[PDB]
Design an enzyme around this catalytic site. Structure first.
Site, PDB file in Angstrom:
ATOM      1  N   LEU A  57       0.841  -1.153   0.000  1.00  9.40           N
ATOM      2  CA  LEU A  57       0.000   0.000   0.000  1.00  9.40           C
ATOM      3  C   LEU A  57       0.920   1.261   0.000  1.00  9.40           C
ATOM      4  O   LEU A  57       0.568   2.282  -0.589  1.00  9.40           O
ATOM      5  CB  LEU A  57      -0.884   0.022   1.275  1.00  9.40           C
ATOM      6  CG  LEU A  57      -2.011  -1.030   1.254  1.00  9.40           C
ATOM      7  CD1 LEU A  57      -2.714  -1.141   2.641  1.00  9.40           C
ATOM      8  CD2 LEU A  57      -3.056  -0.704   0.180  1.00  9.40           C
ATOM      9  N   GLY A  58       2.073   1.239   0.664  1.00 13.96           N
ATOM     10  CA  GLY A  58       2.988   2.415   0.509  1.00 13.96           C
ATOM     11  C   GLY A  58       4.256   2.122   1.281  1.00 13.96           C
ATOM     12  O   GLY A  58       4.359   1.064   1.995  1.00 13.96           O
ATOM     13  N   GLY A  89       7.993   4.324   3.034  1.00  8.70           N
ATOM     14  CA  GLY A  89       8.718   5.606   3.150  1.00  8.70           C
ATOM     15  C   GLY A  89       9.543   5.664   4.391  1.00  8.70           C
ATOM     16  O   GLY A  89      10.149   4.651   4.774  1.00  8.70           O
ATOM     17  N   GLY A  90       9.594   6.860   4.992  1.00  7.26           N
ATOM     18  CA  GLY A  90      10.081   7.066   6.361  1.00  7.26           C
ATOM     19  C   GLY A  90       9.455   6.027   7.292  1.00  7.26           C
ATOM     20  O   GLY A  90      10.185   5.290   7.976  1.00  7.26           O
ATOM     21  N   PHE A  91       8.121   5.874   7.228  1.00  4.36           N
ATOM     22  CA  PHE A  91       7.375   4.800   8.013  1.00  4.36           C
ATOM     23  C   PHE A  91       7.659   3.301   7.780  1.00  4.36           C
ATOM     24  O   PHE A  91       6.943   2.498   8.392  1.00  4.36           O
ATOM     25  CB  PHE A  91       5.856   4.989   7.858  1.00  4.36           C
ATOM     26  CG  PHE A  91       5.434   5.078   6.432  1.00  4.36           C
ATOM     27  CD1 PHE A  91       4.987   3.938   5.760  1.00  4.36           C
ATOM     28  CD2 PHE A  91       5.552   6.314   5.726  1.00  4.36           C
ATOM     29  CE1 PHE A  91       4.627   4.042   4.396  1.00  4.36           C
ATOM     30  CE2 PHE A  91       5.216   6.417   4.371  1.00  4.36           C
ATOM     31  CZ  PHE A  91       4.755   5.274   3.703  1.00  4.36           C
ATOM     32  N   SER A 130       7.541  -0.144   5.350  1.00  2.00           N
ATOM     33  CA  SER A 130       6.621  -0.520   4.230  1.00  2.00           C
ATOM     34  C   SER A 130       5.341  -1.092   4.755  1.00  2.00           C
ATOM     35  O   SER A 130       5.373  -1.836   5.754  1.00  2.00           O
ATOM     36  CB  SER A 130       7.313  -1.617   3.344  1.00  2.00           C
ATOM     37  OG  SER A 130       8.498  -1.099   2.728  1.00  2.00           O
ATOM     38  N   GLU A 159      -5.945  -2.596  11.751  1.00  2.00           N
ATOM     39  CA  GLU A 159      -7.252  -2.721  11.058  1.00  2.00           C
ATOM     40  C   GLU A 159      -7.229  -2.058   9.701  1.00  2.00           C
ATOM     41  O   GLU A 159      -6.395  -1.189   9.446  1.00  2.00           O
ATOM     42  CB  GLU A 159      -8.356  -2.079  11.974  1.00  2.00           C
ATOM     43  CG  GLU A 159      -8.818  -0.750  11.512  1.00  2.00           C
ATOM     44  CD  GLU A 159      -9.749  -0.059  12.515  1.00  2.00           C
ATOM     45  OE1 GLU A 159      -9.240   0.769  13.293  1.00  2.00           O
ATOM     46  OE2 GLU A 159     -10.964  -0.306  12.498  1.00  2.00           O
ATOM     47  N   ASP A 188       2.171  14.058  13.734  1.00  2.00           N
ATOM     48  CA  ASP A 188       2.217  14.104  12.267  1.00  2.00           C
ATOM     49  C   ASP A 188       0.811  14.156  11.633  1.00  2.00           C
ATOM     50  O   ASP A 188       0.482  13.437  10.711  1.00  2.00           O
ATOM     51  CB  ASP A 188       3.077  12.920  11.830  1.00  2.00           C
ATOM     52  CG  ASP A 188       3.583  13.070  10.388  1.00  2.00           C
ATOM     53  OD1 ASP A 188       3.573  14.169   9.832  1.00  2.00           O
ATOM     54  OD2 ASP A 188       3.967  12.017   9.837  1.00  2.00           O
TER      55      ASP A 188
HETATM   56  N1  LIG Z   1       2.535   6.886   6.336  1.00  2.00           N
HETATM   57  C1  LIG Z   1       1.782   6.520   5.118  1.00  2.00           C
HETATM   58  C2  LIG Z   1       2.228   5.156   4.484  1.00  2.00           C
HETATM   59  C3  LIG Z   1       1.402   4.765   3.223  1.00  2.00           C
HETATM   60  C4  LIG Z   1      -0.073   4.798   3.674  1.00  2.00           C
HETATM   61  N2  LIG Z   1      -0.953   4.618   2.523  1.00  2.00           N
HETATM   62  C5  LIG Z   1      -2.037   3.899   2.598  1.00  2.00           C
HETATM   63  C6  LIG Z   1      -2.822   3.780   1.447  1.00  2.00           C
HETATM   64  N3  LIG Z   1      -3.980   2.991   1.645  1.00  2.00           N
HETATM   65  C7  LIG Z   1      -4.266   2.393   2.841  1.00  2.00           C
HETATM   66  C8  LIG Z   1      -3.451   2.561   3.969  1.00  2.00           C
HETATM   67  C9  LIG Z   1      -3.713   1.959   5.251  1.00  2.00           C
HETATM   68  C10 LIG Z   1      -4.776   1.090   5.481  1.00  2.00           C
HETATM   69  C11 LIG Z   1      -5.062   0.575   6.772  1.00  2.00           C
HETATM   70  C12 LIG Z   1      -4.285   0.918   7.888  1.00  2.00           C
HETATM   71  C13 LIG Z   1      -3.213   1.834   7.672  1.00  2.00           C
HETATM   72  C14 LIG Z   1      -2.427   2.248   8.836  1.00  2.00           C
HETATM   73  C15 LIG Z   1      -1.094   2.703   8.756  1.00  2.00           C
HETATM   74  S1  LIG Z   1      -0.060   2.970   7.424  1.00  2.00           S
HETATM   75  C16 LIG Z   1       1.217   3.589   8.522  1.00  2.00           C
HETATM   76  O1  LIG Z   1       2.293   3.975   8.090  1.00  2.00           O
HETATM   77  N4  LIG Z   1       0.825   3.656   9.813  1.00  2.00           N
HETATM   78  C17 LIG Z   1      -0.438   3.161   9.910  1.00  2.00           C
HETATM   79  O2  LIG Z   1      -0.971   3.145  11.039  1.00  2.00           O
HETATM   80  C18 LIG Z   1      -2.934   2.332   6.407  1.00  2.00           C
HETATM   81  N5  LIG Z   1      -2.341   3.325   3.793  1.00  2.00           N
HETATM   82  C19 LIG Z   1      -0.399   6.205   4.210  1.00  2.00           C
HETATM   83  C20 LIG Z   1       0.411   6.296   5.516  1.00  2.00           C
END
Ligand SMILES: N[C@H]1CC[C@H](Nc2cncc(-c3cccc(/C=C4\SC(=O)NC4=O)c3)n2)CC1
EC number: 2.7.11.1
Length: 271
Positions: A10-11, A13-15, A17, A87, A133
């Site tokens: 899904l993405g 980065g800094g965080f 994968s 979730e 953030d």
């Molecule tokens: N920091 C960007 C990383 C790319 C992400 N992009 C997406 C795109 N679609 C769905 C999700 C998604 C779905 C369900 C749950 C989460 C939860 C996350 S992701 C994360 O880093 N920390 C979380 O708690 C994220 N994230 C946008 C957070």
């Protein structure tokens, strides 16, 4: 591990994968987030000694007693990383993507979303957690129910009443006292970031790209925005931290009255 099937990335980065996944036992949609140990600055510990990323302590603190903040379902440790199971609403869209696609949001829609973000940040603070953030990339929209979820606690900290002198969230959402002095208090820096976020929703992009623009704090509107909405934004972006509104003052502002409920918001705006 064998508890989860992995779907697409899904993405990243800094965080680290993050992947879409499904919990095999009951088909529950999940997100699976891999956090490299080398990139974790803050560590915490569990009420039984186990050493964890602070992000896990923070998520557990807010796990309790809402729905506007993402829920940590499980976590695992591996030799070089932790793996968090979160979730995942479905269908969902990240708010950054939604604004990429729709442009500036109609005020009624921005008000419903902003209100829901305020409820989620008040919930973090009530649980003793400062997110650090808040931005459109870190908000998910459940498209069926019109409910938003604040995600990505990997820059967060325990909430405290004294000054913070470290920061690793997004610079273009950070306040002038962080840029100038490397010092901020948690709540007034959170309100500044909510001012950036509200301008982003109603104008379709953030107001400041450069340090010099953040420190000047002068706000120009490139889209038609009501005077009550501009007044709220400019209040949240007060240069002096003590001149910014509290959460209660934001939610009592005239622009915030008559908010739609999440389901009505989905019926009207998200189809
Ligand atoms: N920091 C960007 C990383 C790319 C992400 N992009 C997406 C795109 N679609 C769905 C999700 C998604 C779905 C369900 C749950 C989460 C939860 C996350 S992701 C994360 O880093 N920390 C979380 O708690 C994220 N994230 C946008 C957070």
């Amino acid at each position: 591990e064998s508890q989860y099937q992995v779907g697409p990335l899904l993405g990243s980065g800094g965080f680290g994968s993050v992947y879409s996944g499904i919990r095999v036992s009951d088909n529950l949609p999940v997100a699976i987030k891999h956090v490299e140990k080398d990139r974790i600055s803050d560590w915490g510990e569990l009420p039984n000694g186990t050493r964890v990323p602070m992000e896990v302590v923070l998520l557990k603190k807010v796990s309790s007693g809402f729905s506007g903040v993402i829920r940590l379902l499980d976590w695992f440790e591996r030799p070089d990383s932790f793996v968090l199971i979160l979730e995942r609403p479905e269908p969902v869209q990240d708010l950054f993507d939604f604004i990429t696609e729709r442009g500036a949001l109609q005020e009624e829609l921005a008000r419903s979303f902003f209100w829901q973000v305020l409820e989620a940040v008040r919930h973090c603070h009530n649980c003793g957690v400062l997110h650090r953030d808040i931005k459109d990339e870190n908000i998910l929209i459940d498209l069926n129910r019109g409910e938003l979820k604040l995600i990505d606690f990997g820059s967060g900290a325990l909430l405290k009443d004294t000054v913070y002198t470290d920061f690793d969230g997004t610079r273009v959402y950070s306040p002038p006292e962080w840029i100038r002095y490397h010092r901020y208090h948690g709540r007034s820096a959170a309100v500044w970031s909510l001012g950036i976020l509200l301008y982003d929703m109603v104008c379709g992009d953030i107001p400041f790209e450069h340090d010099e623009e953040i420190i000047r704090g002068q706000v120009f509107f490139r889209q038609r925005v009501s005077s009550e909405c501009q007044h709220l934004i400019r209040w949240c972006l007060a240069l002096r931290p003590s001149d910014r509104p509290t959460f209660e003052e934001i939610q009592n502002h005239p622009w915030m009255q008559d908010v739609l409920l999440p389901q009505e918001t989905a019926e009207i705006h998200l189809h």
